[PDB]
Design a protein around this nucleic acid. Structure first.
Lengths: 153, 110
DNA sequence: AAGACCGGAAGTACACCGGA
DNA sequence: TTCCGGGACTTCCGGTCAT
């Protein structure tokens, strides 16, 4: 269907088809786990597609069934380019998922220093505690990454 | 809120370890205290008479899916057959390590 | 002979939808 | 577009197995 074609197109990073489906009237849907086209575009690193979705009016802070937002995915995957546009369109830098973790937590867990710096610039709260009482700093320490630990203390 | 989300919540709550906890690093978990977990579930769904009987039935409906399944032979043990690392960002193994680390910090403090 | 798990049948509540 | 009827458990239960 149209909604699915949109989900599939975003995942595929087919921005023109995305424009196409949204024109026809494709319903902004999500899969069995609450994954939306924006989560998919940001997760897979589809810049033009993400941008097209944003300029289409899709929910910036859409939540999956584990409470992840597209920013969470983007940060987790290290797509600074995607993280930047999402923030530039009003994405909450401090959104927390099911484990009470922020994009900062994930970009740190996955050692994405540039995304960590970018997040820190967009006012991200550096000292939020996860469901495990961990701030991003703790994650960097647990990961033995002293370079990140220094910017996160 | 779906049963799987609630169980995953409990499984990541260091304070719940006594009623439900992971058993291994492959996704299997056990309802160490099935009736308590059921009571807790009922409180989330606002079902005053929820119990393990009814909760297990709801768990069985998951048998057709790609989320949870039973662990044959092990009393009160089930398994998250979905890929947790892609779902929440941590595997069952990673989650179990983290929840145990948290419980230790708690015991050390108290 | 007398608990843990299974899975069908029926009910409910709430999300989503294609239409008037 | 507003309005509105029409696709995840909860509860109850009969039955298998193995102790």
């Amino acid at each position: 269907d149209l909604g699915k074609k949109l989900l599939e197109a975003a995942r595929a990073g087919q921005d023109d088809e995305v424009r196409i489906l949204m024109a026809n009237g494709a319903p902004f849907t999500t899969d069995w786990l609450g994954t939306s086209p924006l989560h998919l575009a940001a997760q897979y690193g589809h810049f033009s597609t993400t941008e097209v979705l944003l300029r289409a009016g899709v929910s910036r802070d859409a939540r999956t069934k584990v409470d992840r937002t597209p920013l969470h995915m983007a940060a987790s995957e290290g797509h600074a380019n995607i993280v930047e546009v999402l923030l530039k369109h009003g994405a909450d830098v401090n959104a927390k998922d099911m484990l009470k973790m922020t994009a900062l937590h994930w970009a740190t867990e996955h050692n994405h220093q540039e995304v960590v710096e970018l997040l820190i610039k967009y006012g991200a709260d550096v000292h939020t505690q996860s469901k495990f009482c961990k701030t991003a700093f703790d994650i960097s320490i647990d990961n033995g990454n002293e370079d990140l630990a220094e910017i996160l203390q | 809120i779906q049963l799987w989300q609630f169980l995953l919540e409990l499984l990541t709550d260091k304070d719940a370890r006594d009623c439900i906890s992971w058993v291994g690093d492959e996704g299997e978990f056990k309802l160490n205290q099935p009736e308590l977990v059921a009571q807790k579930w009922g409180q989330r769904k606002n079902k005053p008479t929820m119990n393990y009987e009814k909760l297990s039935r709801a768990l069985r409906y998951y048998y057709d899916g790609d989320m949870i399944c039973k662990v044959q032979g092990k009393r009160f043990v089930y398994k998250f057959v979905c890929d947790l690392k892609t779902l929440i960002g941590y595997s069952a193994a990673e989650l179990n390590r983290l929840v145990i680390e948290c419980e230790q910090k708690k015991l050390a403090r108290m």
